[PDB]
């Protein structure tokens, strides 16, 4: 239970030992702290240890609504029958809603600025406040829920609170699906992998296991190679916002006070649409704000997120790179030369073999992100297979997939096909110029931007009764 401070290796701790001549941590008796993930069957001499998913695997907006029953009621506004989600009672972002505050045992957002006294937020997922960028997306979808629930009350005044909440929840879940599979995933996998692992939806298959796979929780960490070392904020004309325009990320983690007291989400959303993401390259894998200084303000020592990813894969007993290549139907290099051809980079192959001895032992994240990106994608062949394979199961295996017959009417389907993330940002913030679709590709202002008008708004007409 002493994992954060002690360095001794007793359960449940699995600290990361410090090598010699480390660039930062000069004392080798120190360590990087690490709690082993909770086993599914504690203390068993029979079952091979597995870990738990605390969330619903489905793409169901459970980051807004929660995945347990009491939490899901705690996020709801139980003062009236308008079916709303609960909002913050002390603060607002130019009138508009903010997420409510959580009441935690050990609150880490209070440590990031002691005079501000701004605790962490309450959303359907516990990690909402990890980054004000993340917090802003959580806030925007809270607002989108309430906007729909208000609009549906206009159409159907006799609908009570439960009916309203559920219908809003249903639409928001479909919007997270449409955005994800129409706009996001094609840009992760690239067109070739997208045809292969996500062919055209037919219908629901109740023999498709929709569970998250253990390896996926480590493979989808590819995104850490996209993290930029600052938070960017922009004024109404997309120029640097006046307080702090380029904040080092080591000073925004759990910094919920920056949303409340430093202009809200409008400037963060603008910097997200008008700043390029980091490009993963074999000699520039991940930035030192996350490799050297992760959570520096709220812990005795800053963490190494790539290293945590690799220790975690070991905590979960995941197989190594070649076993996942074999699984995926990809060739398994044995020698440095064979790995140099797979990576089309012999210098990096040699470095991996220097460390691991064999491509059988390369950790899945490290081998996965070392691979060369697919044409028009941001992952290599191995990660494409794991990520794509997972999302096909979440689609085919979801009885409530928005395109499955019976979930939505044919007209509501034709309406939902018009939604998009830039539209959602218009309807719920003071932002009035947003990205051309595809939002995840558009990154340069003002070339890739347009006014909140050229974009079709969602038509809720077919929701009347």
């Amino acid at each position: 239970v002493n994992c954060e401070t002690s360095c001794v290796q007793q359960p449940p701790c699995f600290p990361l030992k410090i090598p010699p001549n480390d660039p930062r941590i000069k004392n080798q008796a120190d360590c990087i702290p690490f709690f082993r993930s909770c086993p599914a069957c504690p203390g068993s001499n029979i079952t091979i240890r597995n870990q738990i998913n605390a969330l619903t695997s489905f793409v169901d907006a459970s980051m807004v609504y929660g995945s347990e029953e009491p939490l899901a009621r705690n996020l709801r506004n139980m003062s009236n029958q308008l079916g709303l989600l609960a909002v913050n009672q002390r603060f607002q972002d130019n009138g508009r809603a903010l997420l409510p505050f959580d009441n935690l045992h050990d609150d880490p957002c209070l440590l990031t600025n002691r005079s501000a006294r701004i605790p962490c937020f309450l959303a359907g997922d516990t990690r909402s406040s990890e980054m004000p960028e993340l917090t802003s997306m959580h806030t925007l979808l809270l607002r989108e829920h309430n906007r729909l629930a208000t609009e549906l009350k206009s159409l159907n005044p006799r609908w009570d609170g439960e009916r309203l909440y559920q219908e809003a929840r249903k639409i928001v879940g479909a919007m997270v699906q449409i955005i994800t599979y129409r706009d996001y995933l094609p840009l992760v996998l690239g067109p070739t992998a997208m045809r292969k692992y996500l062919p055209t939806y037919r219908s629901y298959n109740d023999s498709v296991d929709p569970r998250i796979a253990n390896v996926f929780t480590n493979a989808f960490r590819y995104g850490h190679t996209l993290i930029q070392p600052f938070m960017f904020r922009l004024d109404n004309r997309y120029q640097p916002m006046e307080p702090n325009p380029r904040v080092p990320l080591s000073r925004v983690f759990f910094a919920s006070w920056r949303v409340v007291l430093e202009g809200g989400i409008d400037p963060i959303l603008r910097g997200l649409m008008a700043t390029p993401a980091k490009l993963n390259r074999q000699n520039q894998i991940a930035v030192d704000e996350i490799r050297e200084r992760l959570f520096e303000q709220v812990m005795r020592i800053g963490l190494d997120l790539p290293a945590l990813n690799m220790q975690r894969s070991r905590d979960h007993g995941l197989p190594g790179y070649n076993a996942w290549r074999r699984f995926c139907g990809l060739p398994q290099p044995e020698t440095v030369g064979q790995l140099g051809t797979v990576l089309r980079n012999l210098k990096l192959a040699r470095k991996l073999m220097e460390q691991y001895g064999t491509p059988n032992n390369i950790d899945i994240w490290m081998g996965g992100v070392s691979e060369p990106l697919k044409r028009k994608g941001r992952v290599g062949p191995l990660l494409a297979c794991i990520i794509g394979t997972q999302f096909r199961k979440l689609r085919d295996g979801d009885r409530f997939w928005w395109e499955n017959e019976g979930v939505f009417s044919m007209q509501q389907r034709q309406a939902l096909a018009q939604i998009s993330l830039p539209r959602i940002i218009c309807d719920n913030t003071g932002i009035t110029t947003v990205s051309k679709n595809n939002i995840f590709m558009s990154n340069s202002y003002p070339r890739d931007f347009v006014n909140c008008s050229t974009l079709p708004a969602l038509n809720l007409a077919s929701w009347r009764e």
């Binding site: 239970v1 699995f14 410090i18 090598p19 660039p23 941590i25 709690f35 082993r36 993930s37 599914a40 091979i48 240890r49 738990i52 605390a54 969330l55 619903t56 793409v59 980051m63 347990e68 993340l134 997306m137 559920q166 929840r169 109740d206 929709p210 569970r211 796979a213 253990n214 996926f216 989808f220 995104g223 993290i227 930029q228 070392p229 910097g271 390029p276 993401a277 490009l279 000699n283 894998i285 991940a286 930035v287 490799r291 290293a307 070991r314 979960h316 007993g317 995941l318 190594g320 076993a323 064999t358 059988n360 032992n361 490290m366 941001r378 295996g397 979801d398 409530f400 993330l421 995840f440």
Partner: protein, 106 residues
């Protein structure tokens, strides 16, 4: 048992798959696409006992791998000309809809 008629998802995911009503539901084990690999066969990770090899080779310290392979000078960062930082944030947001792996509290 799961209701024959269903308009909305349950919060926990229960009863999506009617034949196997916990599939995709919350507070359930991960599925394994490959059997686990652990030092003792069933619970201890590689890197736990000093001197115990993995498949004939010593276990590399994760932080060592990170220093030798992931480290790079911040001033040479390449910005992706065809992806916005919203590409990054949607991934984290979406990650937090699919999985969270609890670990014990301090």
């Amino acid at each position: 048992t799961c209701p024959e008629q269903d308009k909305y998802r349950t919060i926990t995911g229960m009863c999506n798959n009617r034949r196997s009503p916990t599939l995709g539901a919350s507070n359930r084990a991960f599925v394994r696409w490959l059997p686990a690999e652990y030092e003792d066969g069933f619970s201890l990770p590689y890197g736990w006992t000093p001197g115990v090899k993995r498949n004939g080779f010593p276990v590399a310290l994760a932080r060592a791998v990170s220093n030798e392979i992931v480290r790079f000078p911040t001033d040479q960062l390449t910005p992706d000309q065809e992806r916005s930082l919203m590409f990054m944030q949607w991934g984290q947001l979406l990650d937090h809809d699919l999985d969270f792996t609890p670990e014990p509290a301090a």
